Amino acid sequence: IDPFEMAVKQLERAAQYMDISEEALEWLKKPMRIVEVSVPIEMDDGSVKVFTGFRVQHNWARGPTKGGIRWHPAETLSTVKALATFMTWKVAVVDLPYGGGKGGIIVNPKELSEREQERLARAYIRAVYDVIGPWTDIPAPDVYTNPKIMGWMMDEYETIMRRKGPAFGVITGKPLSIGGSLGRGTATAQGAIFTIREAAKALGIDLKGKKIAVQGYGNAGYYTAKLAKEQLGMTVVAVSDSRGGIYNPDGLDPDEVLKWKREHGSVKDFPGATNITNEELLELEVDVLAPAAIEEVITEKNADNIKAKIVAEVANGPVTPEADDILREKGILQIPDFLCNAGGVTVSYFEWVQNINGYYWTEEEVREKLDKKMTKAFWEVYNTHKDKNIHMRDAAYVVAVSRVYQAMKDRGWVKK
Ligand SMILES: NC(=O)C1=CN([C@@H]2O[C@H](COP(=O)(O)OP(=O)(O)OC[C@H]3O[C@@H](n4cnc5c(N)ncnc54)[C@H](OP(=O)(O)O)[C@@H]3O)[C@@H](O)[C@H]2O)C=CC1
């Protein structure tokens, strides 16, 4: 249907478990500032093409808005608004002095050359300059965007700003050569691993020697499996991608699987393991399920088939609202998406702090700070879900919306 309407409905459903005034809820149901701009670039053939750009600042009560820029051909203002709304709750649930933001360009970057991509990034910066800044709106990498594009955008912003303030802090997820931070590459997977370890501690389950299945095998999924094996001592019994999946009960080494996928396009037909389809992976008998591929993979039609005791929602919205009740009834502990994959935005916040302070941290300090942040956030959410006897997603919503509501009331934006 409409992604923004779905996000608003999910917030409205969560609002019944907390004391929030009608005026504040109506304020939260609509983004505070939406910017639509034309993004013109000169193509290689000499012609000029105009693209549609988006930048949505949902709420900046707790601080400057934070959110990545997507470059998908199916990008829609509704999707950007929904993702900015989710970004607000994400930054609020880990206690960040941030707001919720999101940006996007309706473009197919596959048919764009490197020069054209750089021109697109620079033109997007030249178009959205007046509503962004290190203390206003901090973008980041997202779908079909990378640190290279981030560096181009940072350079354009610095050129326009005339180096008056810290231009490194305008955008996060850039290369280490220019204001980048360590631990950014594995940030999401590291945060997910921290939350999984905390969930296992909460359920009284030892993670050593337990099977894990990961759906999707890219920046999130591959690193999630690798860190689960290396840090949590888990056995990786199955991975998957867009093509198919592979299942080996005795375990799989993530590095070999990644090399095979890079050399053959997909993890399919990996030797020593059986080829299985994506839907069969979610129904395995594993200790932890990590669907880090796409949204809405666990529906009402397959929720009863899940046998994992922990479902780590590394991807954005992998479980539908209907499947949430079925999963909870079976007694499965669910880690909500904007809490499970908050490590990426937490490390982006660390990068922004380093940029604005002009002082950069080591990998160990970043890892320890992220560990503490994710542990505190997860324990807050779990304690809220146990105290009020509500769903984990509902508890995360209560925790985030309470913070945003308190910020709004302290700013005097709402009275009630
Ligand atoms: N920094 C991050 O990585 C962040 C991660 N997330 C969430 O993590 C998810 C993935 O992020 P990232 O790893 O960067 O993305 P990538 O696109 O780099 O990797 C996603 C993986 O999912 C696979 N995949 C694609 N379509 C399907 C499908 N229909 N069914 C099963 N698997 C599929 C892809 O296979 P193939 O490569 O063959 O296409 C790929 O291996 C997203 O949903 C995102 O919202 C959240 C916040 C930020």
Ligand SMILES: O=C(O)CCC(=O)C(=O)O
């Ligand atoms: O780092 C950020 O600001 C956002 C990362 C991201 O893409 C997400 O959390 O969805």
